[PDB]
Amino acid sequence: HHWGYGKHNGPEHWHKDFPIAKGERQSPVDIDTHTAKYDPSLKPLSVSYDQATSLRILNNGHAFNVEFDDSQDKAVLKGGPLDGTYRLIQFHFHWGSLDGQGSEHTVDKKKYAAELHLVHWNTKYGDFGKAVQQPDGLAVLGIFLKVGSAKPGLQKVVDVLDSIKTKGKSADFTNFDPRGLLPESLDYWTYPGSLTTPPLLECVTWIVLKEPISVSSEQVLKFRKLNFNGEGEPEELMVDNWRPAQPLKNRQIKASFK
Ligand SMILES: CC1(C)O[C@H]2[C@H](O)CN(CCCCCCn3cc(CNC(=O)c4ccc(S(N)(=O)=O)cc4)nn3)C[C@@H]2O1
Ligand SMILES: [Zn+2]
């Protein structure tokens, strides 16, 4: 009876094994655009992905992760609200069964079709497992997806999904350039929060870009043909793998832009 996104093991149940689910800095949240304050002391984000080394793509039973070599400073996030250097370890998405839902963050209660999370860890803690025990251990860059025109830089991901349909399957995924997933503008909102899946640790600086990327209906349909189940188990489509918005509590969301 492991956690997931079903009726019996979904987000409303997670607090029974992970009591931090009801904590003071949980993610995701609704971003109220009228309440977020412009912070002129924030810096432009520095997204340095030109030396990124992708390795593998894995269906882990709740999403698919594209994994990177983080054994040196190759793909890093710096600046904005961050102190020091955060290394890219993996990206993954959260998506819906229909285009009207799927994102984890919301914007004035608007749900997007999906949400990309680029996950980075603070190199002053030495490894990812040490970084998730610290309040400034991770930085997650969140990017909304809307359905419209295809995203050319997503198609290499879309075309490998048939090879990792079920839980525990992986495939080589070298020479993927994550710069092809970025929007034009790096304007963002930022707040302190958490991992959005168990163990829900309160270790994340969230950086959520204002500008969504556009993907095609055919691209998101391929995400929705993945399975939560293992091979030779009853088929359960991998859809609606998103946590809903959590209470903001004693937090302020800051905007990088006027
Ligand atoms: C195994 C590998 C290559 O994959 C990276 C994955 O992000 C996580 N691996 C397992 C870490 C082992 C103990 C550390 C604590 N921890 C981490 C995890 C896995 N969860 C997570 O790492 C996680 C990351 C991001 C997010 S979100 N949706 O962006 O907020 C949510 C969760 N489970 N327990 C470390 C990884 O290195
Ligand atoms: Zn995520």
Side-chain angles (χ1 to χ4, degrees), residues 89-90 92 94 104 117 119 128 132 140 194-197 199 206:
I89 178 169
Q90 53 102 337
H92 60 273
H94 311 258
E104 298 209 304
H117 287 164
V119 182
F128 179 80
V132 298
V140 183
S194 76
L195 305 181
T196 69
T197 50
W206 276 102

Side-chain angles (χ1 to χ4, degrees), residues 113-146:
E115 189 175 325
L116 169 60
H117 287 164
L118 296 131
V119 182
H120 313 75
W121 59 271
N122 193 331
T123 64
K124 71 195 204 103
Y125 300 124
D127 70 57
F128 179 80
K130 286 286 199 287
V132 298
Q133 298 182 63
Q134 311 297 331
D136 61 350
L138 292 199
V140 183
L141 184 57
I143 303 178
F144 296 117
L145 281 63
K146 67 184 200 193

